Amino acid sequence: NMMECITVSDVINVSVEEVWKKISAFDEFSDYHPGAVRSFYLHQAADQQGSIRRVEMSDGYVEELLVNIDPKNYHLEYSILKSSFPLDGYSAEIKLIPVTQDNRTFIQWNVSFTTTHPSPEALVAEIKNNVLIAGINGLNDYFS
């Protein structure tokens, strides 16, 4: 019943334009996330907003809706429509801010959800380390 909330932020050594280009490509999630086997569009929108992707991982699957995107502010919000995981009301958020010195990128990844999992502290630690931290480090390895 309690609303979980995770916030992970780091600095990737790559320009903000190149980070946004890969992140705004909604279906290319599996290219840089090591836990995602495949990722593709179920339905794609011309204005990006409203696109639905499917991310297949080693545990289960996930189908997410792109609820809002703002290229001028490097802001991106998406939520889970269907999932084989005990994630109810899941919503995620990505915010990029340029780092002028050496032209890097400040990434901030926030998620919020409610779960019926009996051990939620282990579930929030699983998402924080193996989804958010692993995804940021994966984006850093993708641009190596």
Tell me how far apart the terminal alpha carbons of the chain are, to the nearest angstrom: 41
Pair of tokens at residue 15: 């320009």
Question: What does DSSP assign to residue 117?
Answer: -
Count Cβ neighbours within 10 Å for each residue of 35-60 and write b for 16 or more, e otherwise.
Answer: ebeebeeeeeeeeeeebbbbbebeee
CA distance 81 to 122: 23
The interface region with K ion, picked from 27-35, 44-52, 58-66, 73-81 by CB under 5 A, is 27-35
Residue 110 sits in the site that holds Cl ion (CB under 5 A): yes
Binding mask 28-67 for K ion (x = CB under 5 A): --x-------------------------------------
The interface region with K ion, picked from 8-16, 23-31, 39-47, 73-81 by CB under 5 A, is 23-31
Residue 108 sits in the site that holds Cl ion (CB under 5 A): no
- Binding residues (CB under 5 A) for Cl ion: these are 91, 93, 110, 112
- Binding residues (CB under 5 A) for K ion: these are 30
